[PDB]
Design an enzyme around this catalytic site. Structure first.
Site, PDB file in Angstrom:
ATOM      1  N   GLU A  12      -5.231   2.278   1.727  1.00 15.53           N
ATOM      2  CA  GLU A  12      -5.021   1.888   3.124  1.00 15.53           C
ATOM      3  C   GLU A  12      -3.913   2.667   3.807  1.00 15.53           C
ATOM      4  O   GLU A  12      -3.208   2.122   4.653  1.00 15.53           O
ATOM      5  CB  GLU A  12      -4.710   0.371   3.235  1.00 15.53           C
ATOM      6  CG  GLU A  12      -5.811  -0.579   2.751  1.00 15.53           C
ATOM      7  CD  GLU A  12      -5.285  -1.986   2.432  1.00 15.53           C
ATOM      8  OE1 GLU A  12      -4.456  -2.516   3.214  1.00 15.53           O
ATOM      9  OE2 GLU A  12      -5.702  -2.573   1.403  1.00 15.53           O
ATOM     10  N   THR A  17      -9.083   7.670   8.265  1.00 15.81           N
ATOM     11  CA  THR A  17      -8.903   7.634   9.694  1.00 15.81           C
ATOM     12  C   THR A  17      -8.440   9.009  10.171  1.00 15.81           C
ATOM     13  O   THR A  17      -8.760   9.435  11.270  1.00 15.81           O
ATOM     14  CB  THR A  17      -7.866   6.571  10.091  1.00 15.81           C
ATOM     15  OG1 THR A  17      -8.163   5.342   9.417  1.00 15.81           O
ATOM     16  CG2 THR A  17      -7.914   6.330  11.561  1.00 15.81           C
ATOM     17  N   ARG A 154     -12.802  -0.656   9.057  1.00 14.81           N
ATOM     18  CA  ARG A 154     -12.214  -0.521   7.734  1.00 14.81           C
ATOM     19  C   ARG A 154     -13.238  -0.488   6.616  1.00 14.81           C
ATOM     20  O   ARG A 154     -13.950  -1.469   6.363  1.00 14.81           O
ATOM     21  CB  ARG A 154     -11.237  -1.669   7.472  1.00 14.81           C
ATOM     22  CG  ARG A 154     -10.742  -1.787   6.030  1.00 14.81           C
ATOM     23  CD  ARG A 154      -9.865  -0.617   5.566  1.00 14.81           C
ATOM     24  NE  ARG A 154      -9.606  -0.720   4.130  1.00 14.81           N
ATOM     25  CZ  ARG A 154      -9.338   0.306   3.326  1.00 14.81           C
ATOM     26  NH1 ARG A 154      -9.277   1.530   3.812  1.00 14.81           N
ATOM     27  NH2 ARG A 154      -9.194   0.115   2.021  1.00 14.81           N
ATOM     28  N   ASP A 176     -11.263  13.990   0.921  1.00 19.81           N
ATOM     29  CA  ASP A 176     -10.866  12.595   1.105  1.00 19.81           C
ATOM     30  C   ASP A 176     -11.077  11.793  -0.188  1.00 19.81           C
ATOM     31  O   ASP A 176     -12.183  11.735  -0.718  1.00 19.81           O
ATOM     32  CB  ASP A 176     -11.681  11.966   2.241  1.00 19.81           C
ATOM     33  CG  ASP A 176     -11.026  10.682   2.798  1.00 19.81           C
ATOM     34  OD1 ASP A 176      -9.884  10.372   2.359  1.00 19.81           O
ATOM     35  OD2 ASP A 176     -11.635   9.996   3.669  1.00 19.81           O
ATOM     36  N   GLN A 180      -6.630   3.434  -4.215  1.00 17.49           N
ATOM     37  CA  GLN A 180      -6.345   2.364  -5.186  1.00 17.49           C
ATOM     38  C   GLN A 180      -6.016   3.012  -6.531  1.00 17.49           C
ATOM     39  O   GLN A 180      -6.401   4.158  -6.792  1.00 17.49           O
ATOM     40  CB  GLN A 180      -7.552   1.428  -5.361  1.00 17.49           C
ATOM     41  CG  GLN A 180      -7.823   0.498  -4.188  1.00 17.49           C
ATOM     42  CD  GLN A 180      -8.060   1.232  -2.894  1.00 17.49           C
ATOM     43  OE1 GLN A 180      -8.731   2.270  -2.865  1.00 17.49           O
ATOM     44  NE2 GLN A 180      -7.530   0.699  -1.810  1.00 17.49           N
TER      45      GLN A 180
HETATM   46  N1  LIG Z   1      -2.792   0.289  13.987  1.00 16.15           N
HETATM   47  C1  LIG Z   1      -2.997   1.358  13.163  1.00 16.15           C
HETATM   48  N2  LIG Z   1      -3.952   1.283  12.273  1.00 16.15           N
HETATM   49  C2  LIG Z   1      -4.220   2.280  11.445  1.00 16.15           C
HETATM   50  C3  LIG Z   1      -3.479   3.480  11.493  1.00 16.15           C
HETATM   51  N3  LIG Z   1      -3.985   4.308  10.541  1.00 16.15           N
HETATM   52  C4  LIG Z   1      -4.950   3.703   9.933  1.00 16.15           C
HETATM   53  N4  LIG Z   1      -5.121   2.441  10.468  1.00 16.15           N
HETATM   54  C5  LIG Z   1      -6.072   1.431  10.068  1.00 16.15           C
HETATM   55  O1  LIG Z   1      -5.676   1.019   8.710  1.00 16.15           O
HETATM   56  C6  LIG Z   1      -6.875   0.796   7.917  1.00 16.15           C
HETATM   57  C7  LIG Z   1      -7.013   1.801   6.767  1.00 16.15           C
HETATM   58  O2  LIG Z   1      -7.179   3.133   7.324  1.00 16.15           O
HETATM   59  P1  LIG Z   1      -7.961   4.049   6.247  1.00 16.15           P
HETATM   60  O3  LIG Z   1      -8.244   5.389   6.831  1.00 16.15           O
HETATM   61  O4  LIG Z   1      -9.326   3.346   5.803  1.00 16.15           O
HETATM   62  O5  LIG Z   1      -7.006   4.218   4.993  1.00 16.15           O
HETATM   63  P2  LIG Z   1      -7.365   5.023   3.646  1.00 16.15           P
HETATM   64  O6  LIG Z   1      -7.548   3.917   2.737  1.00 16.15           O
HETATM   65  O7  LIG Z   1      -5.990   5.826   3.328  1.00 16.15           O
HETATM   66  O8  LIG Z   1      -8.585   5.822   4.055  1.00 16.15           O
HETATM   67  C8  LIG Z   1      -8.003   0.828   8.947  1.00 16.15           C
HETATM   68  O9  LIG Z   1      -8.693  -0.274   9.533  1.00 16.15           O
HETATM   69  C9  LIG Z   1      -7.482   1.919   9.922  1.00 16.15           C
HETATM   70  O10 LIG Z   1      -8.054   1.709  11.219  1.00 16.15           O
HETATM   71  C10 LIG Z   1      -2.424   3.571  12.456  1.00 16.15           C
HETATM   72  O11 LIG Z   1      -1.736   4.586  12.538  1.00 16.15           O
HETATM   73  N5  LIG Z   1      -2.210   2.492  13.277  1.00 16.15           N
HETATM   74  F1  ALF Z   2      -7.979   2.321   0.631  1.00 18.46           F
HETATM   75 AL1  ALF Z   2      -8.715   3.934   0.363  1.00 18.46          AL
HETATM   76  F2  ALF Z   2      -9.553   5.455   0.318  1.00 18.46           F
HETATM   77  F3  ALF Z   2     -10.050   3.268   1.358  1.00 18.46           F
HETATM   78  F4  ALF Z   2      -7.244   4.691  -0.374  1.00 18.46           F
HETATM   79 MG   LIG Z   3     -10.450   6.214   2.630  1.00 14.91          MG
END
Ligand SMILES: Nc1nc2c(ncn2[C@@H]2O[C@H](COP(=O)(O)OP(=O)(O)O)[C@@H](O)[C@H]2O)c(=O)[nH]1
Ligand code: ALF
Ligand SMILES: [Mg+2]
Lengths: 322, 182
Positions: A12, A17, A154, A176, A180
């Site tokens: 997360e 994103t 998400r 990407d 976890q």
């Molecule tokens: N408010 C806000 N939400 C964010 C930001 N960056 C990511 N998110 C939200 O945090 C959640 C995880 O983003 P995600 O890209 O799926 O994280 P990943 O797990 O590293 O891919 C989502 O619902 C995104 O919309 C940010 O800078 N501000």
């Molecule tokens: F939480 Al993830 F890719 F969706 F690190």
């Molecule tokens: Mg991801």
């Protein structure tokens, strides 16, 4: 001649994103069709999040705002999140509309709002609130997710994904991965011929613990992942850029919670966004055994990411030189 | 107790050196880890010492003891002053703290899923039987793949072409002693 960029970070942290912004800014973007594919995910987000709010109200012993809502709360804990469709984080529209009334009432219950304020005690994504506050637009039968909804949707990433794009004859391959602990075991399968590593960190999760164990501090975990990565010799000749993301969420948080209550090694005004960012920067820089670039981003703000990536792009190119 | 919204998505998701020196695949993961992260000398030093237990003392000396070896390690003053079993035993003794941290770091990162080949070590640690001999064969076969992999993508171990090669030869030598070859 390909520029290979690794998106690394804890769960997360904004990795996907950031990748959706690349598509928006340097790719074909997302049209009505592309965006319409996120609707099931967005509805899964709302339903599953409300169910967490409802379960937390009960287990935390927070009085209902209105006892009659105990019925909807129940109609909600009845949703089978293990059924084939919902288990893939997808919910059909007509199913979504059947629960809309119970959900909209629940979100208006002051007791559900109280559980929300205490989300750091359980597990929830801030994005559910964005969507909960917009039920009137997701309620429309012809609902089509705006670009903004697409960036907020998400969906946990699993496995390795590559996204090739271009920025003026320069070839870019963006990797990407999942963040976890279980997904990390896969990272090593994409470490070679890497040009740069963009390391995402949710700057706002200092008052949160991991989903993997509900005990480890979320910022503490990033610091440790970053430590193993910024010190791997396989990356000694690879530029590493730090993205203290979710800056917008950190701005809101430093007003209501003091980071000092989590990291006693902190000093300065805990309610001052500038002092907290200084500290976060110092902690990551302090993990290097022996050229640390960093930016404060908000991955969901397209215009913010456009400015930033322009700068990251010239950094990744002028460094790849020597 | 409280439900997590992504809990169902992930549902189905090295205590001491003496404990890993006879398990080739696990040792390769540690070895690999230490090579990319810290100073490889201490650990290679203890593994070769234990291998000593006469001609395999000049090797050890020019690789770890002599002030000019590519893989020099800190030697107690007393030792570096002056039985043959005493030095080796002592030299090892002065590596414990350094090897203790490397081990600890490796155990932490592994919990974090940040160490190499967890997948192979899982598949290996999974299989069951009472046939020790055949279980060890499985360990070696995996270790070969891993060792084979360490040799290939290792130019990243160190800039010093001689260093990274002193490291690989040091690990091969030890792997060979456990029946593992590329
Ligand atoms: N408010 C806000 N939400 C964010 C930001 N960056 C990511 N998110 C939200 O945090 C959640 C995880 O983003 P995600 O890209 O799926 O994280 P990943 O797990 O590293 O891919 C989502 O619902 C995104 O919309 C940010 O800078 N501000
Ligand atoms: F939480 Al993830 F890719 F969706 F690190
Ligand atoms: Mg991801």
């Amino acid at each position: 001649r390909l520029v290979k960029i690794l998106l690394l970070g804890a769960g997360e942290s904004g990795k996907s994103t950031f990748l959706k912004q690349m598509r928006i800014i340097h790719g074909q973007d997302f049209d009505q069709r592309a965006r319409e594919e996120f609707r099931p995910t967005i509805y899964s987000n709302v339903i599953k999040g409300m169910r967490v709010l409802v379960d937390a109200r009960e287990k935390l012993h927070i009085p209902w705002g209105d006892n009659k809502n105990q019925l909807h709360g129940d109609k909600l804990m009845a949703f089978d999140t293990r059924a084939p469709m919902a288990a893939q984080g997808m919910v059909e529209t007509r199913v979504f509309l059947q629960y809309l009334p119970a959900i909209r009432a629940l979100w208006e219950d002051s007791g559900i709002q109280n559980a929300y304020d205490r989300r750091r005690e359980f597990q929830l994504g801030e994005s559910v609130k964005y969507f909960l506050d917009n039920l009137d637009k997701l309620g429309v039968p012809d609902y089509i997710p705006s670009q903004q909804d697409i960036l907020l949707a998400r969906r946990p990433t699993k496995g390795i994904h590559e996204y090739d794009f271009e920025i003026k004859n320069v070839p870019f391959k963006m990797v990407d991965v999942g963040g976890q602990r279980s997904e990390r075991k896969r990272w090593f399968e994409c470490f070679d011929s890497v040009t740069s590593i963009l390391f995402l960190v949710s700057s706002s999760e200092f008052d949160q613990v991991l989903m993997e164990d509900r005990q480890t501090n979320r910022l503490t975990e990033s610091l440790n992942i970053f430590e193993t990565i910024v010190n791997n010799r396989v990356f000694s000749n690879v530029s590493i850029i730090l993205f203290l993301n979710k800056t917008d969420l950190l701005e809101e948080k430093v007003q209501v919670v003091s980071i000092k209550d989590y990291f006693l090694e902190f000093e300065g005004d805990p309610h001052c966004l500038r002092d907290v960012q200084k500290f976060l920067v110092e902690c990551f820089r302090g993990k290097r055994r022996d050229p640390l670039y960093h930016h404060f981003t908000t991955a969901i703000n397209t215009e913010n990411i456009r400015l930033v990536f322009r700068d990251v792009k010239d950094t990744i190119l002028h460094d790849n030189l020597k | 107790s409280i439900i997590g919204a992504e809990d169902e998505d992930f549902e189905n998701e090295f205590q001491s050196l003496e404990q890993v020196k006879r398990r080739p695949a696990h040792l390769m993961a540690l070895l690999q880890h230490v090579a990319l992260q810290f100073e490889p000398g201490p650990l290679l030093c203890c593994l070769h010492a234990d291998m000593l237990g006469k001609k395999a003392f000049l090797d050890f000396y020019h690789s770890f003891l002599e002030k000019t070896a590519v893989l020099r390690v800190p030697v107690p003053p007393n030792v570096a002053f002056e039985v043959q079993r005493r030095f080796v035993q002592e030299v090892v003794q002065s590596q414990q703290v350094a090897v203790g941290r490397q081990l600890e770091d490796f155990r932490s990162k592994r919990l974090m899923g940040m160490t190499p080949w967890e997948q192979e070590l899982a598949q290996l640690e999974a299989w069951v039987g009472r046939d020790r001999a055949s279980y060890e064969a499985r360990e070696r076969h995996v270790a070969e793949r891993l060792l084979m992999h360490l040799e290939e993508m290792q130019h990243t171990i160190s800039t010093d072409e001689e260093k990274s090669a002193a490291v690989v030869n040091a690990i091969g030598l030890y792997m060979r002693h456990l029946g593992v070859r590329t």
